[PDB]
């Protein structure tokens, strides 16, 4: 069965959805693909109802996907101690190590700190004058500062952990051996920061991770340190890219930006809609393997068959969202899965929402004249990574 198409279906263009995803949702919503690594074939799931089953059911296992022969989107076999590769109830125990810092209530308590950080960084951009690179002054330093303060990672390590993090998000830019090397380096660095808390615990998540290493009974050192790596990767890589992505959607059809200048209270709802609209995950997902037969819309997936979701395709499902292909800030309902679903639903969802809200609210309030000040055709979209975003975004005002 080398008659099954390669997935991804193409090198990506900006934030475009391959038009094949809409054809798949209409006519073949569950279809066999060959992923770029591991062996064999995977079902690609393109509709919302099927995505909620694959993401939401104990009969689908991520643990089972750690087999190096399992199809996957990324060069290195999955790390078995990785939070994504855990199944409940062990996954539930692992998430509770840190989950209290990420509840909507605790995240809301960060809004003051977070708005202060944004204000200061836009002051520096103003000091530099127009035009300036929004990536340099906002999209990079803002989420990096927030995740360093929440975990207790020194800000001086920015260049070191951003390099490791970009490598671990490789799709084609690096080989398995280059990434496996970075994984070991990152594991050894994070293990070292957590060890610093041996006779010196801190009031931060690394503090919590170091106590769990000392006192905790069901979780390995590996699982615990790896959680530190996942949070430090996700905690900046998502938001840094999503700020560039959402600003890109706002300035390339400037009525969108103008609608938020007019009404900055629209910003929370605009952030939800642009989370729906944006393929932050360039293609596919961490894989789920059926442990029993499971009925999806058009097929029964057999025990042992792997499945992969395209989150941004589920987020264009025309049986769930009216005019799904259109950016609409006035949707009454937006049941998107930009943050996933089921056990592995994004732990940082509330922190992402907060950072995007405060970054956009500030821009829309203080920079009514904001425009893209480099050509669209020349935009430096990140190539060869599992996520999408801009290396640079020169803006004027
Ligand atoms: C706009 C921001 C974000 C987006 C769009 C986003 C998106 C996602 C998605 C779709 C997943 C599900 C992956 C899957 O099940 O296959 C996920 C999981 C995850 N996200 Fe986020 N995320 C964001 C922000 C964050 C932040 C700020 C953090 C960390 C502070 C974070 C940490 C994670 C982690 C650790 C997981 C894995 C959770 C688990 O396996 O239980 N994310 N994210
Ligand atoms: C195949 C696409 C996915 O990538 C992966 O699985 C990566 C190899 C993970 O190891 C990354 C590096 C982890 O750090 C995650 C915790 C990051 C967090 C933001 C996500 O879960 C993210 C959505 C992720 O699932 C997708 C990018
Ligand atoms: C941060 C993330 O952590 C786990 O999910 C993986 O095993 C891997 O080490 C890394 O990609
Ligand atoms: Na742009
Ligand atoms: Na996988």
Numbering used by the authors: 11 to 407
What's written in the study?
The bacterial P450 OleP, from Streptomyces antibioticus, is an epoxidase involved in the tailoring steps of the biosynthetic pathway of the antibiotic oleandomycin. More specifically, OleP catalyzes a regio- and stereospecific reaction of epoxidation at the C8-C8a of the macrolactone ring. Among the known macrolide epoxygenases from actinomycetes, OleP presents a unique epoxidation chemistry since it targets a non-activated C-C bond, which is a reaction not easily achievable through conventional chemical synthesis protocols. In addition, discordant findings have been reported concerning the timing of OleP activity during the tailoring phase of oleandomycin biosynthesis, showing that OleP is either active on the aglycone intermediate, 8.8a-deoxyoleandolide (DEO), or on the monoglycosylated one, L-olivosyl-8.8a-deoxyoleandolide (L-O-DEO).
The omit maps of the ternary complex structures clearly revealed the presence of a bulky, partially defined, electron density within the solvent cavity of most of the OleP monomers in the asymmetric unit of both crystals. Since this density was absent in the omit maps of the corresponding aglycone-bound OleP crystals where the L-rhamnose was not added, we interpreted it as a molecule of the sugar. However, the freedom of movement of the sugar molecule inside the cavity, which is only limited by sterically prohibited contacts, resulted in poorly defined electron densities of the ligand. Successful refinement gave an average of occupancy of 60% for each identified L-rhamnose molecule. Due to its flexibility, to the absence of chemical linkage to the aglycone and to the available room in the solvent cavity, L-rhamnose adopts different positions, orientations, and conformations inside each monomer, contacting via hydrogen bonds and van der Waals interactions: (i) OleP residues present in the cavity, (ii) the aglycone moiety bound to the active site at C3-OH and C5-OH, and (iii) solvent molecules. Most contacts established in the crystal structures by L-rhamnose with OleP correspond to the ones observed in silico for the glycosyl moiety of docked L-O-DEO. These contacts include E89 and G92 on the BC loop, and N236, V239, S240, and I243 on the I helix. L-rhamnose in the ternary complex establishes contacts with M178 on the F helix and Q193 on the G helix, which were absent in the docking simulation. All the abovementioned residues are located on secondary structural regions that participate in the open-to-closed structural transition.
